[PDB]
Amino acid sequence: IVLTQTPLSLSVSPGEPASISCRSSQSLEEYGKNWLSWYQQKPGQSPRLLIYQATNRASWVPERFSGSGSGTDFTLKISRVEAEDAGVYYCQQYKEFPWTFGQGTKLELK
Amino acid sequence: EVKLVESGGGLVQPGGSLTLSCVGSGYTFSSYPICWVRQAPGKGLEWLSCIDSSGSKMHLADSVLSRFTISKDNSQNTAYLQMNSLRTEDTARYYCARGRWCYGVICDMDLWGPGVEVVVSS
Amino acid sequence: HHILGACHSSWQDAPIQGTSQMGAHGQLQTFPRNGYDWDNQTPLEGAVYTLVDPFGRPIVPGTKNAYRNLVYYCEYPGERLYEGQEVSVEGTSGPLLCNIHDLYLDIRRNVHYSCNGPQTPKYYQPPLALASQKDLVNEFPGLFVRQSRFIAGRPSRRNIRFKPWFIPGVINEISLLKPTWNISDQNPHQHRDWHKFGHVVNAIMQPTHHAEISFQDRDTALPDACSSISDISPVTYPITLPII
Amino acid sequence: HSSWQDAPIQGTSQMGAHGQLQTFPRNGYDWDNQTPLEGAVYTLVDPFGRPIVPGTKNAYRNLVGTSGPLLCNIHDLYLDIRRNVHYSCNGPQTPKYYQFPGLFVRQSRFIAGRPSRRNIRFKPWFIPGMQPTHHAEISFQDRDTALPDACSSISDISPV
Amino acid sequence: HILGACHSSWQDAPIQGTSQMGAHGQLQTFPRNGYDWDNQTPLEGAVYTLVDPFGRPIVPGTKNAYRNLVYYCEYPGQEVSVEGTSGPLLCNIHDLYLDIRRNVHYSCNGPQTPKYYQPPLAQKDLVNEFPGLFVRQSRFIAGRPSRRNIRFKPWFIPGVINENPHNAIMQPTHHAEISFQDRDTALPDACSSISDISPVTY
Incomplete structure (x- = not known):
């Protein structure tokens, strides 16, 4: 299993929503258990967490986050961005043996 | 403030042995896992080497399947990453993360610690 | 023969985040500010705070008239009336499989017991078919607290436990060998050990x-x-x- | 012992004892087969969790303790070991195959949103035997x- | 009559691959990675570990870290179950009104309860050794659907007690x-x- 994260570069206007697609080359099962995770770099610090499974806000930071998708195509949505939302975003899953990881995609503010 | 306490790294010649530490605070470490997260500098993330929670299943990654022994201590809450037959590949900053279940899926890779550097060369 | 009247509670205010206020028998109860444990002073990092009712119907904080503290008397309250005991109900469960060894398969059922009588805490107690006031009425807290441990290290945990929140209240009037520490005024389990012979x-x-x-x-x-x-x-x- | 019975049919409603509408509802519908439902999956099961395929001639028939050591903290107004006790009954009152609904409708729901759930509900199909x-x-x-x-x-x- | 305090001696934590002849014709065992309960049939990830009856893990190969717990036989002194209750509970009711109910568990803490230390009471017929080393199986099954399972198998090995399995x-x-x-x-x-x-x- 290799994850396909696309596109690598995202030009994000401040306030506008952003959509990022991480599509799996293998089936991530069905309406119960389509799994994925999203981690985020903050440069100069430890990388942190912002979205789970491209549905809901991972951290307890406010309601400005979103997400949708299922099956094999996963949509990473944000309602309204901040200045601290820059970095590179890692779509990740480990739901099979022995190990997989994804690529990562970058966010740029305008 | 609660912080991961990570040290014990340094410059080690290849083929050598080094032991690291992931020390936490504010919790009883009675039966709790520990490992690290690799990140080659300027490269995408990956995982290195673990045993099971009490030490039953010894499964590793593809390129590191016979070079790493992982030990902890349930009392002092101090981890250990003991390596053997060191090579050029696994020089990376190692991050000690949190993982659990919320009735059976992954809910955390919660806070990544400070990171000690292991830069190696022949 | 005597008949006791109905009883109720006092409609009170939901607690404010950061308030530490005192109940009877010296037990302090606190509604902590974030970054603190039970004692609200020892270092914790990631707990935010909001209370909870018994039956999963939570309470908006800072709300007047939000909960009624439930009521329960002493066990065998008629035997403390002169200076109404609930029973268990047997039940049966659904079908289930088994396995049998010997030196085979068989089918049985599980059993649980339930009580729903006067000594169960309720909201509006019906009338029941001499002693003072405070020796016969209680205030079992009708609001529980619920804690969230978000501490760095390894790992975060999902520790769901409950603990009461005791407030004094005004109780409506009713229109009609033994250790001494058990039958004293400073025992919360007075209503449970008034008659049991031996230390508890x-x-x-x-x-x-x-x-x-x-x-x-x-x-x-x-x-x-x-x-x-x-x-x-x-x-x-x-x-x-x-x-x- | 109980007689053999064939499996029910999808989308079919029958009348049994005591004036109740026993039926096997369809997908997207609730128990009444008129009220819409979101994403339910409906199968038929034996009373012990093992599946029975539909369209089967004589699919089923009808029916007519301690634990180990546990640590517990002690508060006095200390570490100690106590055990848990359950109860069970295995006499004539216990239903059996050999000497009730012999089949059960499954309601493998899913409710989405915030918060979500997942509910497995049993509704007794009762065709008399x-x-x-x-x-x-x-x-x-x-x-x-x-x-x-x-x-x-x-x-x-x-x-x- | 009055008895005294009872315990047993220590043991050695076994290494994986050891099967010692237990009492009454049972061969306890501790299988390696990817093997079944008689160490001959391969499997994906059913791999076995040791924990205490409290749940405390044991590092394998340690010397004198666990002693098998000890309990007393049936009617050596018997005890009656302890009553108790949880808090208020609410569920639905059918009739052809919200109502508050409480469920009742039990407990037992007599001489028949296995313990680290035996309190006195007021030789092979009276005392015994409970298996204090249990094997925790973290069995995993992949596929469609997917379940993981845990079943406990004992390690009944004897110690020494100071002066049919049931x-x-x-x-x-x-x-x-x-x-x-x-x-x-x-x-x-x-x-x-x-x-x-x-x-x-x-």
């Missing part, structure tokens, strides 16, 4: 309905699992110790 | 004792 | 299934079943 020591369980499912992630990879999630109420047991 | 809750509060990293994003809660074979 | 073995089960996101709807894919550390013996 408590036992506390938090039964945890936990489960293990499918796939997980790194740290010890594979099954990296420790978490415990308990019920909605501490199950406190009494134990009679000999005194002679 | 206290609910346990592994309750939940599920969330990724929020305040663990506030309103969550998800849950997961089995209802068992038959409420007591 | 049945319906029930394993109570717990289940939980996560649902996420509801576009593709081929088939549901999850269940579970988790036993206890000890057999429910009828």
